[PDB]
């Protein structure tokens, strides 16, 4: 969508996408479509754009409306970055899974480290259905088939909520006591020991010990639950 703002000469002397084929233009949630074709790296590369030693075959869309179920360059899956040579031609293919309803302009792009986004032609694809139906099943090397859309979420929520409530309780222990004004006057007069009583310092130890304890038990429990 933002290709229109890139330097005209850059758009013309970098990468040329041809033989492009979109397998569909009307998908429903959980359905897949593919984009195939070839691209030719121009030997007269721009000086200010680093040569593509490190490139990544990306997809141009407004957030994960699709999910990149796979992507191949010359027949190999390319989840990592790759290397290209000036003047070569490559065959590529991308497999998308519809996730969010709407109408989206789907572009094929190549990120070049030290360069930038190199956006290919876009196509209008329509997704129909309800996002609540999206499923992303996965089987692990333990199998253990899970749903990557919501897997491990309760753990994140629980742990973050617990630590937050612990930190709130620390402040609350000191919030009931009048703060600011009496404390200022105290240290100004020379009573620096305002509310740091022995009982107030032993509460600090409990928190510090209860903390250093929970971390260790939690590390052990994690190592035992996910060997």
């Amino acid at each position: 969508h933002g290709e229109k703002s890139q330097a005209a000469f850059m758009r013309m002397r970098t990468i040329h996408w041809f033989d492009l084929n979109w397998s569909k233009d009307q998908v429903s949630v959980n359905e897949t479509m593919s984009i195939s074709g070839k691209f030719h790296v121009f030997a007269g590369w721009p000086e200010t754009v680093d040569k593509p030693e490190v490139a990544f075959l990306n997809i141009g869309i407004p957030g994960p409306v699709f999910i990149r179920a796979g992507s191949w360059i010359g027949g190999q899956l390319v989840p990592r970055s790759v290397s290209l040579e000036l003047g070569e031609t490559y065959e590529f293919k991308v497999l998308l899974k519809a996730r969010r309803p709407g109408d989206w302009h789907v572009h094929t792009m190549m990120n070049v480290q030290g360069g930038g986004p190199i956006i290919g032609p876009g196509k209008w694809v329509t997704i129909t259905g309800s996002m609540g139906d999206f499923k992303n099943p996965i089987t692990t090397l333990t199998g253990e088939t899970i749903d990557l859309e919501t897997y491990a979420l309760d753990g994140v929520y629980g742990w973050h909520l617990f630590w937050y409530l612990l930190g709130v309780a620390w402040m609350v222990y000191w919030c009931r006591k009048p703060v600011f004004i009496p404390r200022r006057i105290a240290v100004d007069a020379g009573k620096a020991d305002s509310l740091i009583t022995p009982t107030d310092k032993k509460v600090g130890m409990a928190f510090a010990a209860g903390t250093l304890a929970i971390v260790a038990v939690s590390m052990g429990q994690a190592n035992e639950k996910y060997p």
């Binding site: 990544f56 997809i59 869309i61 957030g63 994960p64 699709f66 990149r68 899956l77 989840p79 990592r80 970055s81 990120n111 480290q113 996002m131 992303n136 996965i138 692990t140 090397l141 333990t142 899970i146 990557l148 859309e149 919501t150 897997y151 491990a152 753990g155 994140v156 742990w159 973050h160 630590w163 937050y164 612990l166 930190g167 620390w170 402040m171 000191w174 009048p178 703060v179 600011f180 004004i181 009496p182 404390r183 200022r184 105290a186 240290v187 020991d193 509310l195 740091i196 107030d200 310092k201 600090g204 130890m205 510090a208 903390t211 250093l212 971390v215 939690s218 429990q221 994690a222 996910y226």
Partner: protein
């Protein structure tokens, strides 16, 4: 003298306290959040950036800045025990609001992909180490080492489920890598990912602990510097 009673002054103090706390909380939240989200927060944005070398090294270092500065006057002026806890509570609240209402609510990245880092443990231990020992250099050293070392252990129980290996179309990937692969980030190519990649001078499994000790050592100096920086921010000079 002209209010009403001496108990009226207690109520006036209480109301002032609630206002001052509000304003400090939110102003420090703004500043801290911008500093964090612009020095070490790409690792904070995505789970597939929370690696063993650069995340564990950068998060605590840049995170210990504001806690130390705010502590330089919320301790020697009002003996306030919290102040690092308050900084971290603000940072976490801001980050969670943004992740849930913009990252997920606006662009629809799944929440289990963009949740924030956990910095509550180190904060509490730092506050306590300062309450006891009432020392800036003692706290500097010990609390810096703790801050640096408690980070990865404090986060592991949260990201462990996403480190289960998976074979995807012939390549081996963790669930976090699979997330980073599925949910397209048109603005974040894979090669910018600054994560541990292994070297000839690296050992097979020693990144997490070494990066947590290096981070603790550097947090020592960071706390040292920002203690004085915060002491300056507390100045009442007029020009």
């Amino acid at each position: 003298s002209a209010v009403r009673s001496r108990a009226e002054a207690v109520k006036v103090s209480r109301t002032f306290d609630y206002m001052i706390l509000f304003t400090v909380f939110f102003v420090v939240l703004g500043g801290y959040h911008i500093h964090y989200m612009l020095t070490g927060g790409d690792w904070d944005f995505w789970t597939d950036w929370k690696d063993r070398r650069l995340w564990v090294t950068v998060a605590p270092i840049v995170s210990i800045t504001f806690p130390a500065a705010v502590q330089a006057v919320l301790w020697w002026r009002y003996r306030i025990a919290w102040g690092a806890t308050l900084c971290v509570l603000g940072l976490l609240l801001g980050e969670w609001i943004n992740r849930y209402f913009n990252f997920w609510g606006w662009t629809y990245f799944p929440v289990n992909f963009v949740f924030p880092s956990n910095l509550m443990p180190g904060a509490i231990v730092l506050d306590v180490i300062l309450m006891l020992s009432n020392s800036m250099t003692l706290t500097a050293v010990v609390g810096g080492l703790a801050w640096g070392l408690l980070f990865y252990p404090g986060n592991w129980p949260i990201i462990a489920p996403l480190h289960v290996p998976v074979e995807y179309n012939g390549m081996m990937m963790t669930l976090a890598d699979l997330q980073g692969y599925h949910y397209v980030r048109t603005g974040t190519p894979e090669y910018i990912r600054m994560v541990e990649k292994g070297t000839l001078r690296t050992f097979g499994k020693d990144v997490a602990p070494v990066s947590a000790f290096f981070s603790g050592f550097v947090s020592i100096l960071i706390y040292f510097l920002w203690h004085f920086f915060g002491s300056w921010f507390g100045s009442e000079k007029f020009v």
